[PDB]
Structures are given as C-alpha cells and as structure tokens.
C-alpha cells in the first residue's frame, strides 16, 4: 500500500461523498405537504363531528380540538378562514412545504397555487 | 481504508441500487385504477342526484359537474355512453391504468376485459 | 537510502498487505441476503397484485413476472412452494448467502434456520 | 518507495480510520425507535381486530398474538398498561432506543418524555 | 427536474431524457470514462445496457 493508491482512495471518497447523498430539502418538502394534507383531512372529519353536535361548522380551532383534533403540527400554520351553518373554508401550510392547501366541504382538501413563502390565501381558490 | 475495500463498497452499492428500487410503473397502475374507480363511484352518486331533480339520467357530464362532480381526473378519459329515464352506461379509464371500467345502475362500477391501450368499449359488458 | 531501510519497507508492506484487506466473503454474504430479502419483498407485492386481478395467489413465477416482477436475481434460486385462494408460501436463497428465506402473507418475509448449502425447505417454518 | 512515504501512508491511514467510521450507536437508536413504533402500530391494528370480535379491548398480549400480532421484537419490552370496553393504554420501548412510546386510541402512537434507561411509564402521558 | 432539485449533470456525464409521457419515461446516462451506458425506466428501474460509452448513446431503453 502506497501514496498513489491512497490518493486514488481519497479521490474516489470525494466522488462518492458528493453523489451518494440525496437532496434532503426536496424529500422533506413532500413529507411536509403530507403532514398538511393529513391534518386538513382530520380537520374535515372534526368539522363533520361538530356539525353532528351543533348543526353548524366551527370557525374556531379549539372546538375541533375539544372534539379530538390534535394540536396544529410543528411548523404548520392552520386557519379556519370562514364558517357558517352550511360551509367552511380552512387553509393550512408548512413553512417548509411547497404550497398552501385549502379545504372546503365541496372541493375536499386540495393544493392552491400560492407558495408557503407567500402570505396565506384569504379565501378558498 | 484501501482500494480493495473501496471496490467492495462500489460492488455492493451497484447491487443495492439494482434491487432496493420498486417497480414504479406497476405501483402507479394500481393507484390509477383506484382513481378511475373512485371517479365512477362519484359519477354514480351524481347520476342519482340528477335523477332526484329530473326523473331521468344525464347523457352529458356537464350536468353532473353542475351538481357537484369534479373535473375528469388528469389522464382519465370518461364518457357517458348512453342514458335514459331508467338506466345509464358510463365508461372510464386512465391512460396508465390496467383496463377500462364500466358503470351501470344494475352492475355497479366494475372492470372490463379491455386494456386501456385499446379503444374504449362502445357499451357495458 | 540503503538495503536495511528497503528491508524495513518490504517488511511493513507485508504487514499492511495482510491486515488492510477486508473479509470479502463475509461482506458479500450480507449483501446477498439483502438481494434475497428484496426479491421476496417484490414477489410479495406481485402476489397482492395477482390477488387484485384473480382473487387467488399464484403458484407459478411467470404470472408474477407478467405483472412486473423481474427475472430471479443471479445466483438466487426462488420457488413458490404452494399457493391457494387465501395463502402462499415462497422460498428463496442465494448460493453465497447465509440461509434460506421464506415468505408467507402472515409472517411476512423472514429468515429460516436452513443454511443455503443445504437443500431448500419444503415448507414455511 | 521509502520509509518516509510509508510513514505518510501510515499517518493518513490513521486519519481515515478515525473519521470515515459512523457513530453506530446513534444510527441503531433511530432504527430501534422505528421497531418500537412499528410494533405499536401493529398492536393498534390488532386491538381494533379484537374489538371487532369481542366489543372490548384486550389487556393481555396473548389475545393479540392469537389474532396475528407477532412475538414482541428482540430487546423490545411491551406492556398493555390498561384496557376496557372503550379504551386501552399500551407502552413499549427498546433497551437501546431513545424513549418509551405510548399508544392510546385517541392520541395514536406517540413518544413519551421518559428515556428507555428509566423504568417504563405507569400510564399514557 | 433541476428546478425541482436535481443537480447539474455531473462532470463528464452526458444525460438525456429520451422520451416521456403521462405514464412512462426513458432516460439514458453515461460517463465518457465509465464502462457502459445506463438506462432508467419506471418499470425496469436503473440498469446497465450492453452499449460501451465509446459508442453513441442508445436511442431507447433496452
Ligand atoms: C395540542 O395538543 C397538545 C398535545 O400534547 C396539548 O394538549 C396542547 O395543549 C392543550 O392541552 C392542555 C392539556 O390538556 C390544556 O388543556 C391546554 O388548555 C386548552 O384546553 C383548555 C380546556 O379545554 C381550554 O380552556 C378553557 C375551557 O375549558 O373552556 C377555555 C377558556 O380558557 C375558558 N375561560 C373562559 C373565561 N371561558 C376556560 C377557563 N374558565 C374560566 C372561567 O376562566 C378555565 C376552565 O379556567 O378554559 C384552553 O383554552 C386550551 O384550549 C392546551 N394548551 C394550550 C396552549 O392552550 C394542545 N393545544 C391546544 C390549544 O389544545
Ligand atoms: C373541472 O373542475 C375544475 C376545478 O378547478 C374547473 O372548475 C373546470 O373548469 C370549469 O369551471 C370554470 C370555473 O367555474 C368555469 O365554470 C368553466 O365553465 C364551465 O361552467 C360554465 C358555467 O356552469 C359552463 O357554462 C354555460 C352555462 O352556464 O350554461 C354553458 C354554455 O356555455 C352556455 N352557453 C349557451 C349558449 N347556452 C352558457 C353561456 N351562455 C350563453 C348565452 O352563451 C355563458 C353563461 O355565457 O355557459 C361551461 O360550459 C363550462 O361547463 C369550466 N371550464 C371549462 C374548461 O369549461 C372544471 N371543468 C368543467 C368543464 O366544469
Ligand atoms: C427475466 O428478466 C429478463 C430481463 O432482461 C428477461 O426479460 C427474461 O427473459 C424473458 O423475457 C424475454 C423478453 O421479453 C421473453 O419475453 C422471454 O419469454 C417469456 O415471456 C413470454 C411472453 O410473456 C412467455 O410466453 C408465452 C406466453 O406469451 O404466454 C408462454 C408460453 O410459452 C406460451 N405457449 C403456449 C403453448 N401457451 C406462449 C406461446 N404461445 C404458443 C401458442 O406457443 C408464444 C406466444 O408463442 O408464450 C415465456 O414463457 C417466457 O415467460 C423470457 N425469457 C425466458 C428465458 O423465458 C426474464 N425471464 C422470464 C422467464 O420472464
Ligand atoms: C412469538 O412468535 C414466535 C415466532 O417464531 C413464536 O411463535 C413464539 O412462540 C409461541 O408460538 C409457539 C409455536 O406456535 C407456541 O404456540 C407457543 O405457545 C403459545 O401459543 C399457545 C397456543 O396458542 C398458548 O396456549 C394455550 C392455549 O392454547 O390457550 C394457553 C394456555 O397455556 C392454555 N392452558 C390452560 C390451562 N388454559 C392452553 C393449554 N391448555 C391446557 C388445558 O393446559 C394447552 C392447549 O395445553 O395453551 C401459549 O400460552 C403460548 O401463548 C408460543 N411460545 C411461547 C413462549 O409461549 C411467539 N410467542 C408467543 C408467546 O406467542
Ligand atoms: C447546475 O448546477 C450548478 C450548481 O453550481 C449551477 O446552478 C448550474 O447553473 C444554473 O444555475 C444558475 C444559478 O442559479 C442559473 O440559475 C442558471 O440558469 C438556469 O436557471 C434559470 C432560472 O431557473 C433558467 O431560466 C429561465 C426561467 O426562469 O424560466 C428559463 C428561460 O431562460 C426563461 N426565458 C424565457 C424566454 N422563457 C427565463 C427568462 N425569462 C425571459 C422572459 O427571458 C429569464 C427569467 O430572464 O429564464 C435557465 O434556463 C437555467 O436553467 C443555470 N446555468 C445555466 C448554464 O443555465 C446548474 N445548471 C442548470 C442548467 O441548472
Ligand atoms: C366562530 O367563532 C369565531 C370566534 O372563534 C367567531 O365568533 C365567528 O362568528 C360568530 O360570532 C358569534 C359566535 O362567537 C355568533 O353568534 C355567530 O356564531 C358568528 N357570528 C357571525 C358574524 O356569523 C364564528 N363563526 C363564524 C365564522 O360566523
Ligand atoms: C343527453 O344529452 C346529450 C347531449 O349532451 C343528448 O342530447 C342525449 O339525447 C337527448 O337529446 C335531447 C336532449 O338534448 C332529447 O330531448 C332527449 O333528452 C334525448 N334524445 C334522445 C334521442 O333520447 C341526452 N340523453 C340521451 C342519451 O338520450
Ligand atoms: C399454480 O400453477 C401451478 C403450475 O404452474 C399448478 O398448476 C398449481 O395447481 C393448480 O392446477 C390448476 C391450474 O394449473 C388448477 O385449476 C388449480 O389452480 C390448481 N390445482 C390445485 C390442485 O390446487 C397452481 N396453484 C396451486 C398451487 O394450486
Ligand atoms: C385483561 O386480561 C387481564 C389478564 O390477562 C386481566 O384479567 C384484566 O382484567 C379482567 O379480569 C377478568 C378477565 O380476566 C374480568 O372479567 C374483566 O375482563 C377484567 N376485570 C376488570 C377488573 O376489569 C383484563 N382487562 C382489563 C384490564 O380489565
Ligand atoms: C372545547 O371544549 C373544551 C372542554 O371540553 C373547552 O371548553 C374549550 O374551550 C372548547 N373549545 C372551544 C373554544 O370551542
Ligand atoms: C350545469 O349547470 C350550470 C349552471 O349551474 C350550467 O348551466 C351548465 O351548462 C350545466 N351543465 C349542463 C350542460 O347540463
Ligand atoms: C404472464 O403473461 C404473459 C403475457 O403478458 C404470458 O402469457 C405468460 O405466460 C404469463 N405467465 C404465466 C404463465 O402466468
Ligand atoms: C389466543 O388464542 C390461542 C388459540 O388460538 C390460545 O387460546 C391463546 O391462549 C389465546 N390468547 C389469549 C390468552 O387470549
Ligand atoms: O350570542 C349567542 C349567539 O352566539 C353565536 C350563534 O351561535 C348564535 O346562534 C347565538 O345566538
Ligand atoms: O327539446 C326539448 C326536449 O329535450 C330533451 C327531453 O328532455 C325532452 O323531454 C324535451 O321535450
Ligand atoms: O382447468 C381450469 C381450472 O384451472 C385452474 C383453476 O383456476 C380452476 O378454477 C379452473 O377451473
Ligand atoms: O369471569 C367471566 C368474566 O370475565 C371477564 C369479563 O369478560 C366478564 O364479562 C366475564 O363475565
């Protein structure tokens, strides 16, 4: 074993260290959007449960939490934009997701065009 | 650390890179058939809602969309083949699914023998 | 530079050449068991896909290959020992792995006690 | 090739041998917590299956094992702390994980504040 | 792909997306000092072809 073999080894380590590591940011973005989607799907179940008890939808998250919806996930900002006897609009996004998601009782849970780095939508697209 | 250990590492990377990656096409085919099945189950709900209002089934998708059926999913081609006061036939398929699906009020939503690469059925099997 | 320094260099080369080379057989055994495990995990996905289409499991590998399971890996011998409407047993092993692996829909993919140098299990342990 | 090149080679081997080896304990801790999480997610599926058959949850692991839950994993200690017609609390931890995990039908499977080196929680946090 | 987070094609690697559709892709890549061209498709995964890197790149997935 000699200095030229060791330089080849060092050179190949430098190559493998550069290429065998994934884009961690891109992976976490897609996982983060899954958290937002899952949390809005839960908020939708709890809006229906609140509708069973009260014949109206909630405008405030604490009513949904009472019924069994968990704390808003870490780095997820969630808001109920509006609610009535017959409809709701909810918006949620992760600071390191891709886009804001919206939920309404007609469109279900769906992704908006607005990036999470922009201020949240004021209404359902 | 030496060139022979590094060649073993490269050899084992080549093995794991070959075997630890799933068949993505096969996975997406089964998910795509789920989209088609779900969209036909929705079209069936909306055919019944149109029947509530009009005492007949629709032949045109825009009537179902008015009532609340969403846009045909990406890469899904959907058609209402025929309709009357008493029956309908609907056909749908995803360009990367397995087979065309049919829906009728007697048979429910069911898969046909026709592959999505062939032209769509002209009628319910 | 003199003959005594060169004999020291030769002596130390003989030492480093003896100790800095890994056990290649042991490394390849663990990689080979990973190939077998990965191939059985794929065969399990394709048994479920065949179950989607046929309401039964396959007894023959060519049906799984049609659906998208790849050729049995080099030096891996794979067999479907039995199958029915409700269960399967599959066995696989690499001629230079450690042990035969078994797969069933209840136990998942798991390693058996039988070394790959012995004849393959006739059934799931 | 001379004694000074060979001393440089030995010096650089000593460096690479020190830095190119990962913290194995830290890696195994995160894998071990995955085993505990996965086993509690399975115990939760089997609590629901026992609820299908008996209209109550189990307090004893052997009932879950009968239904299809596998042996408690190596080095995982699992306990069903309490159960009733309407709720359960289960606790599990790996002796070389990070913390004890808890499972309840409301909170799902979640990690507690208690390190695995401390005695297991007597109840769900 | 680069917009989404895929890095610049590596030094001396020539990469091409040969074809793509709603349902499939074929990609080919090779290093001028590698052994052979590699292909990627969503069914076969990433796999090595028979074509040496000194020959012109495959026009399709083998
Ligand atoms: C998200 O989940 C995590 C999981 O670990 C965690 O549970 C979070 O913290 C919350 O849960 C805590 C532990 O249970 C606390 O409950 C805590 O308070 C929340 O729950 C209170 C009871 O439901 C709620 O309180 C109220 C009430 O009972 O109505 C609401 C008002 O404060 C009300 N005051 C008035 C004037 N009406 C009463 C008040 N009554 C009077 C006369 O003053 C009480 C009885 O003294 O209290 C709280 O408002 C709150 O929702 C909660 N933590 C936080 C940060 O609030 C969980 N996150 C949330 C927000 O649920
Ligand atoms: C699938 O879902 C996605 C979700 O993002 C999206 O909503 C798609 O696009 C559709 O939705 C758009 C936003 O709401 C538009 O509504 C758009 O138009 C569709 O809806 C129209 C109103 O229902 C419909 O129009 C009609 C009508 O109101 O009856 C139909 C005829 O054009 C009619 N004309 C005549 C001559 N009778 C009238 C017309 N009147 C006259 C006198 O000219 C209007 C009032 O001027 O308009 C449209 O035909 C259409 O269904 C829609 N986009 C597309 C591409 O059409 C959604 N996809 C669909 C098709 O719904
Ligand atoms: C493992 O993967 C590697 C990847 O490089 C490689 O693909 C291996 O080789 C296989 O793939 C080849 C290239 O596609 C060939 O397909 C080859 O044949 C296999 O596939 C055939 C078509 O699916 C299959 O054939 C059948 C059929 O289509 O049903 C089966 C019978 O032979 C049948 N005969 C009868 C009498 N029923 C027909 C026959 N019909 C008649 C009337 O005779 C044909 C239409 O003439 O053919 C083959 O049996 C086979 O599975 C395949 N190579 C080998 C070695 O078989 C791949 N390994 C396998 C085994 O898939
Ligand atoms: C974790 O998984 C590994 C996977 O390799 C392995 O399977 C472990 O060992 C278990 O599985 C073994 C092979 O199947 C054995 O089944 C073994 O026993 C377990 O299963 C028994 C049958 O379900 C169970 O037995 C019972 C019963 O059938 O009810 C329970 C009582 O002992 C009962 N006795 C009484 C007095 N009621 C009967 C008893 N009857 C009488 C009248 O005496 C029998 C019929 O004679 O037996 C066992 O209790 C046990 O769960 C099992 N190994 C171990 C260590 O128990 C697997 N680990 C477990 C615990 O399942
Ligand atoms: C491989 O990685 C290395 C890492 O060091 C390096 O990043 C390489 O260079 C690239 O990255 C640079 C630094 O960020 C530059 O981004 C550079 O440009 C690339 O990225 C541009 C922005 O994404 C892209 O541009 C576009 C666009 O934003 O859409 C594409 C068109 O040019 C488009 N024009 C038109 C007419 N539609 C616009 C254009 N708009 C108009 C109206 O003219 C702009 C806004 O004026 O620009 C570039 O095309 C390019 O991808 C990039 N370097 C090179 C050599 O391109 C990195 N390699 C690549 C190719 O990403
Ligand atoms: C949901 O609660 C909101 C505060 O958490 C807010 O109060 C919203 O407005 C209501 O105000 C009171 C209840 O607090 C009223 O009696 C009505 O429920 C409603 N008022 C109006 C103007 O509609 C409430 N829901 C929404 C969005 O209406
Ligand atoms: C459903 O709408 C079709 C066009 O979107 C088409 O018009 C079908 O045929 C109808 O034609 C008019 C309505 O447009 C008639 O008054 C009847 O509803 C019907 N005509 C016939 C020949 O049945 C219509 N439904 C179907 C398939 O009949
Ligand atoms: C799976 O295919 C086997 C040959 O590749 C073999 O044929 C097995 O036995 C079947 O035989 C025919 C199908 O070829 C029958 O109609 C049944 O599917 C089955 N027969 C019996 C005895 O069960 C077949 N699967 C297994 C293991 O049954
Ligand atoms: C679950 O089984 C436990 C032993 O494995 C224990 O027996 C628990 O207590 C029960 O005791 C008998 C059943 O063995 C009773 O009829 C009830 O099921 C229950 N008794 C009490 C005090 O609740 C049993 N489940 C739990 C935690 O109750
Ligand atoms: C939910 O109910 C709890 C008690 O169970 C508290 O009253 C809480 O304030 C409620 N949330 C709201 C504000 O509706
Ligand atoms: C559905 O109703 C909308 C208005 O709500 C439009 O009139 C649309 O044309 C209708 N679809 C059809 C063609 O029946
Ligand atoms: C799998 O299907 C192919 C055609 O797609 C061949 O028919 C092949 O014989 C099949 N395998 C078996 C034997 O089931
Ligand atoms: C689970 O059932 C088996 C038989 O299938 C044994 O009876 C075993 O004792 C059962 N476990 C318990 C104790 O509930
Ligand atoms: O102030 C009470 C008022 O609060 C809110 C609504 O629920 C109304 O129905 C109710 O009358
Ligand atoms: O042209 C009007 C005609 O259109 C269609 C059917 O709905 C008929 O009942 C109706 O009379
Ligand atoms: O011989 C036909 C026979 O083959 C096999 C099984 O699939 C049976 O269900 C079938 O009837
Ligand atoms: O001793 C029998 C007793 O055991 C336990 C519970 O399941 C009770 O419902 C039951 O009556």
UniProtKB/Swiss-Prot annotation, chain E:
It is found in: Cell inner membrane; Cell outer membrane; Periplasm. Disruption phenotype: Deletion mutants show defect in both DNA transformation and twitching motility. Coiled coil: none annotated. Induction: By growth in minimal medium or low temperature leading to a significant increase in pilA4 transcripts. It comes from the Bacteria. Found in three forms of 14-kDa, 18-kDa and a glycosylated 23-kDa form. Both narrow and wide pili are glycosylated. Disulfide bonds join 26-61. Plays an essential role in the assembly of two types of T4P pili: a wide and a narrow that participate in natural transformation and twitching motility. Major component of the wide pilus that is essential for natural transformation working as a DNA translocator structure that spans the inner and outer membranes. In addition, participates in the assembly of the narrow pilus composed of the PilA5 subunit that is required for twitching motility. Interacts with PilQ. This is Type IV wide pilus major component PilA4.
